[PDB]
Design a protein around this ligand. Structure first.
Ligand SMILES: [Zn+2]
Lengths: 682, 683
């Protein structure tokens, strides 16, 4: 579906968008002039409105009021601040839930989710759909041809909570979903099979949603269904809006992060004009790498098209058990990281910190400390930096193509989440992250690519715990390697087909010819009981934890790079841990256990040399993350990030210094403090 | 603010320190009572509490009340010279009541009916239950009217130990009315609670629902407050029936005051009793002594230095923890003495006789299953003898002396700190005063723990420990206190929000920044939730901050920095102020920018106190023993000494007559206390 970016207010040039969601219907109106003045001072050129404002718009059934919203849009418009308008359907009013409790979601035991909870509505509720679609229409009619409205923010963060509904509506929708996908009940039974204690289904009317063992095939599809049910609802809403206002681009805010495991966002991405994401930092060592990863993923989801950062935090969030604040410079750096990874818009949640409500301790662009605060000063500096990058022509440039793509796959994640796997300590989502960080440690910025993206055009691909391999997936991987591709393939790859039906005759399934390895069972690892086998040393100085493959046999042309070292009694001593295997013009290395970020990093030079993937032999390669956006004219925008907890010194990129935070430009070398960032144009 | 009335002796008897426990005769055969009574007399037991859970044995069926079994045992107790603290007997309703009226049963957050057999399975706001309860109160009062054995009323039992949170239809309606009464108009409600970013304001009181398992923190604050008020009302209702029929019997209800108690506003409830009574159970380990001393001090603060009643404690182990450690030799006597020293004029246990069955069977008692020939019973006897000795020495009605420093405790600040969307779940209000109590004790200063509405503003110094909620009136008291020469210790997590949990603006601490001399824009929470997370901050005086530090952006020109943080420069905390001191006219303000814990505070106390001009004993042995002092009007002084450490210590002998000693020794020049030892002197 066609890429469509939000366009400037009439009279304005195209700028990197910079703003936050704004909630003036929750403040007295006399506040707005100060907010706007501070917005303009910060370099803020957009705000997102009406997201949770339904009860202030449809104040009673059928009755729509727009006075307050028109007044604030008017003020914002005169200051030159655009409005990313919401469908306002995210959070229904109390009169709606009180008159119509059948729109309220049910949990696994039939407990009604009380209003006041966020997203307490059934995505498959026909009644709620009618109310919501009416509101979309009223909103779209009213703001039709208003030059202040530059995009639609449809709903808000779908499935942040209402992902799992067990109401009657959901039960029927899941049946119909199964009907559309499988046609006949025989094909369903073929897909799901049977739990040993139960028997085949006789009709679609016998299908019930899985609850808290469950049928893994049914659970896989049920998760799939939940994403589709919410996708359909978003599409219905989007379709109402583009009918009335066909020239205003539409989006909804995704929640892409390394561990996100609800929506298939790559699938959802086909239904948006532009991809927008909300990302909040992971505290600690993973702060930089996980943000970089998620941002790389969003761009992969965007097929290297410009995307929109709809939300992040200026400092601490409010929803963890412990909410650390951001360190100095991280506010700007994090924003630059999203930017470098292809964003052409940087927004926050929220503009102004609140004195009450559950979000009161959540940071904002304008903290309770007010205009005289380090955050606000940093927000202003950020606005200036984005303005500077705008003028240097960064807009619409694309995140350059990596030498290696790391495959991410939401469905394999779903499959790995079942409670009867070899171990609960292995999930799909951590392996791609680990590979991203390890390559970064060797000075290689990878592209994180969803499984349906074109990773098979890259020089190399990482296949990290891709549990689910369809035959077509097997062919792409086979074709890729035969034609010269280099592949890194790990444990927990190709265990089953698209229906979670385990492959037979040995693991990895389907692609054993390419990989050159056969596995009959796994060796899970841990400390659950005294004396349990908790780790396996690998012969190259690394250690595997949580799970290792038991490699039974390798092909005659398979080379062993490293073996496991263990007590002989385990049957794992001398067994292959890392292998490399030629397949025509490629190209396949196999990693038989979870090595973690460092273990992979430690193994990378030896694996890469055997595959013929050139690595920088510089031991300082990992010190800084280089992220590069490219224009058609050949202009290159290189961002540099300190990955470490110490000041580093690096060779100066060629070109003009555009931006610097906690960093220093010199003639021969460049200097970045911890959390520092530099941007150059060459 | 109600008039103090202490339970008075049986006719013909002198005033003695009360000593007893709740007694269980409707759960034993009657032929046991003579032996129990004989053993009580031998133990020095002069009082028991009866009928607490005995409703089903009194109103044996709807409308029918029998008192025979109870009249008989009271008679036996009376002839033995043992007084009775009678209960309203309304704590645990009979099954015939819950069966005919399940509408009295509580609902959980999800609407599940709490089944009978759980204790306090009843709705505090049930009108049907209140009528049944008040009928029983009246019957109890009619029947024991003018009975001379009955010296007090034990109204109900430990309100809100379990039934604090009810989500039934009654609670929903009661909470609206509670809100209507407190705010008048829905405009005032919405102004108080604000909005969650995802929802919008209320249009009417009828739209108000109780918060459940994120919530609106302002609403949750008030809901907790409501839950306390709803139970307070029910107690007042019962109390009013009993004092109407028998106006000459003083009434109480048993509180559960301990360092971490977080349900009822007991300071508020204290305004509704004739005398304050408390139930306290020891905290095992290093905190055993200090937490008991703290809790007892608090009761005395709550009681405005008037005598209070220890209604319950354990002789040895309890039964409701995951591991129930037993008491060490001497701890039984010491703990009773610790309560006593902190102002109790009564010492009672749960329970008199250990039971063979029921969930309490492993809970220790005054008379264990092991029987009369047991270490606990021998100890009980020695204690009873010692209380008689202290009675004759004239300790009754003496007051816990006025400390040089008060430590402010605040249930509402605790409530507010309990919300799941704060900077961290590892900071609660309740631990901070406790820490300060222990630290001063480690420097030889017994502090008075004072609830926020007590007169901490008359003391030489005050500790403001995580007092999250600061009203404008609260800010003025502190300002006036310090201006007029008071010395204050103020910590992180103080003055964050107003009384409605609305965060103060322009910087923290709110309102009192002029006094404190420090400005904070945000917090720096600490922990190990993720790898490489910042988990601690070294302080330049050798201490370490955990869980949370303030980010102090700027200080006043007359603010002096005593210690700074030491950290990775990348954190933005390196060299930043950790402990400051600030003159404000004639005071008086030290700021502590993170959680130092007992040892960290204790280490910091000399340098802070020297700067504030608070004189400390330079004796490094100051912490070895806790000195607690009760005072009479005539000038009589009762000084108790408690060993705080795990080794035998030696101290300068107090002046006066040695009255009591357990695991301790009197000598001419020096005094000796073994671990867990206690001495008492009259001077
Ligand atoms: Zn239920």
């Amino acid at each position: 579906r066609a890429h469509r970016w939000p366009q400037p207010l009439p009279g304005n040039d195209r700028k990197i968008w910079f703003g936050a969601d704004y909630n003036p219907d929750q403040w007295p109106e006399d506040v707005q002039d100060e907010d706007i003045r501070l917005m303009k001072q910060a370099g803020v050129n957009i705000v997102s409105l009406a997201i949770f404002s339904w009860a202030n718009i449809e104040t009673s059934d059928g009755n729509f009021e727009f006075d307050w919203l028109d007044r604030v849009i008017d003020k914002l418009y005169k200051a030159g601040i655009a409005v990313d308008l919401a469908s306002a359907t995210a959070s229904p009013p109390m009169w709606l839930t009180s008159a119509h409790p059948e729109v309220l979601r049910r949990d696994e035991q039939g407990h009604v989710i009380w209003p006041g909870a966020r997203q307490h509505w059934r995505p498959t509720s026909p009644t709620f759909r009618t109310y919501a679609l009416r509101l979309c229409r009223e909103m779209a009619e009213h703001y039709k041809d208003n030059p202040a409205i530059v995009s639609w923010h449809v709903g808000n963060e779908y499935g942040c909570h209402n992902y799992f509904d067990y109401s009657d509506d959901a039960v029927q929708a899941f049946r119909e979903w199964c009907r559309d996908r499988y046609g006949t009940i025989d094909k369903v039974n073929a897909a799901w099979g049977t739990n040993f204690w139960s028997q085949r289904l006789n009709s679609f009317e016998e299908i019930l949603p899985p609850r808290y063992f469950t049928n893994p095939g049914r659970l896989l599809d049920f998760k799939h269904f939940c994403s589709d049910a919410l996708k359909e609802f978003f599409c219905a809403e989007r379709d109402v809006l583009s009918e009335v206002t066909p020239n205003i681009p539409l989006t909804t805010n995704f929640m892409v992060s390394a561990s996100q495991n609800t929506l298939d966002y790559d699938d959802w991405a086909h239904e948006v004009d532009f991809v927008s994401n909300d990302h909040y930092f992971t505290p600690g060592s993973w702060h930089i790498d996980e943000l970089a990863y998620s941002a790389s993923l969003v761009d992969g989801i965007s097929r290297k098209k410009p995307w929109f950062l709809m939300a992040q935090s200026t400092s601490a969030v409010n929803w963890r058990e412990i909410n650390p604040r951001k360190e100095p410079g991280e506010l700007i750096r994090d924003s630059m990281l999203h930017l470098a990874m292809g964003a052409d818009a940087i927004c926050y949640f929220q503009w102004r910190q609140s004195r009450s409500g559950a979000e009161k301790f959540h940071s904002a662009m304008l903290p309770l400390a007010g205009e005289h605060s380090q955050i606000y000063r940093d927000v202003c500096a950020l606005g200036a930096d984005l303005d500077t990058l705008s003028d240097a022509g960064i807009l619409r440039s694309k995140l350059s193509k990596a030498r290696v793509a790391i495959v991410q796959d939401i469905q394999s994640e779903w499959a790995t989440e079942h409670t009867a796997t070899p171990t609960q300590h292995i999930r799909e989502w951590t392996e791609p992250l680990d590979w991203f960080a390890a390559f970064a440690n060797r000075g290689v910025t990878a592209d994180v690519t969803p499984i349906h993206a074109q990773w098979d055009t890259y020089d190399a691909v990482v296949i990290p715990c891709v549990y689910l391999f369809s035959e077509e997936m097997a062919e792409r991987l086979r074709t890729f390697v035969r034609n010269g591709g280099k592949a890194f393939v790990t444990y927990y790859s190709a265990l089953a087909d698209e229906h979670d039906r385990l492959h037979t005759e040995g693991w990895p399934g389907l692609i054993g010819d390419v990989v050159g390895v056969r596995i009959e069972e796994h060796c899970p690892l841990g400390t659950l009981f005294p004396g349990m086998l908790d780790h396996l040393d690998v012969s190259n100085g690394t250690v595997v934890h949580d799970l290792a493959d038991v490699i039974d046999a390798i092909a005659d042309d398979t080379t062993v790079l490293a073996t496991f070292e263990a007590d002989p009694a385990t049957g794992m001593d001398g067994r292959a841990a890392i292998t490399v295997h030629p397949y025509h013009e490629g190209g396949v290395a196999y990693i038989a256990g979870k090595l973690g970020r460092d273990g992979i990093s430690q193994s990378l030079p030896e694996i890469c040399a055997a595959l013929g993937f050139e690595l920088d032999a510089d031991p300082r390669a990992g010190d800084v993350l280089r992220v590069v956006r490219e224009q058609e004219d050949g202009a290159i925008f290189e961002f540099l990030f300190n990955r470490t907890r110490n000041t580093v010194t690096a060779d100066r990129p060629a070109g003009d210094m555009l931006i610097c935070s906690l960093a220093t430009d010199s003639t021969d070398k460049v200097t970045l403090e911890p959390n520092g960032v530099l941007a150059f144009r060459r």
